[PDB]
Amino acid sequence: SVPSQKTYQGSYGFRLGFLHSGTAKSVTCTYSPALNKLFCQLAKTCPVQLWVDSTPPPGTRVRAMAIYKQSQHMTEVVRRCPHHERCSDSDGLAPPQHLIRVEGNLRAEYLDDRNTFRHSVVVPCEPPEVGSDCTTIHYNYMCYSSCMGGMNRRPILTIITLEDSSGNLLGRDSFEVRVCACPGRDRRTEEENLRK
Ligand SMILES: CCn1c2ccc(C[NH2+]C)cc2c2ccc(-c3cnoc3)cc21
Ligand SMILES: [Zn+2]
Q1: 43 and 63 in contact (C-beta within 8 Å)?
Q2: For a substitution probing ligand 1, which of 14, 51, 54 has the most ligand atoms within 8 Å of its CB?
Q3: Which residue in 87, 112, 133, 169 has a CA-CA distance of 20 to 30 Å to 96?
Q4: CB-based contacts of 32, cutoff 8 Å, min separation 6
Q5: Distance in Å, CA 129 to ligand 1 centroid
Q6: Are 145 and 151 in contact (CB under 8 A)?
Q7: What's phi and psi for 104, nearest 5 deg?
Q8: Which stretches does the entry tag as region Interaction with E4F1?
Q9: Among residues 143, 144, 88, 77, which one has the least CA distance to residue 115?
Q10: From the CB of residue 59, how many other CB atoms can be counted at a distance below 10 Å?
Q11: Looking at residue 146, what DSSP letter applies?
Q12: Ligand 1 contact, 177 CB (< 6 A)
């Protein structure tokens, strides 16, 4: 099966937000609103903001999962490639097979679904720090889009779901991801292709 990617704000008005990082050659993570696409370097911090219009209950959680974007590949589990799953870059918590990690959150939990075999990472939903308007999760993507035997140049989506304590759906948002060596140049190139 294929997890839903339908945008759903739900009762709490859940949606993502992204910083405005620009497209300089040196940028390590940059988001294109026109493409709804995040471009990032391998294993580098990707800040993703969480926004709600009203406060969700204690025990609400936030899950991230990757799927292939193209219909002919969406049934295949997105995982790290045969090299990266063996490179012993573990953070002590993420299984080495998982593409998506959460950085710097000791409460992150990693799921291998017993039925679909898909990977996901889930954290408690926390309120913004005093003085802030939103909460930020720091994600890492642990393979390049081009990795042979893994993503192998196939585009992926990240689906972020807001869930209750049982795992029921409260909200959903999503964005395409390209993990690449030069996110700034690739964002500029793909945005110009879209314009042309
Ligand atoms: C999704 C993260 N988030 C927000 C993001 C933006 C804004 C709006 N600021 C102007 C408010 C919240 C907010 C309020 C409460 C909680 C909460 C309580 N208990 O668990 C989670 C989580 C919250
Ligand atoms: Zn890889």
Answers
A1: no
A2: 51
A3: 169
A4: 38, 39, 187, 190, 191
A5: 9
A6: yes
A7: 65, 35
A8: 161-196
A9: 77
A10: 11
A11: T
A12: no
d(CA 78, CA 120): 10
Euclidean distance between CA atoms 7 and 29, whole angstroms? 23
Tokens representing 23 are 């497209």
Q: Which atom of ligand 1 is nearest to the CA of 135?
A: 2
Of 169, 136, 125, nearest in space to 9 by CA? 169
The structure tokens listed for 7 are 């945008």
CA atoms within 13 A on the CB side of 39: 27
Give the technique used to solve this structure: X-ray
Indicate the resolution in Å.
1.4
What gap in Å lies between CA 112 and CA 47, rounded to an integer?
24
1-196: which CATH topology? Answer: Immunoglobulin-like (2.60.40)
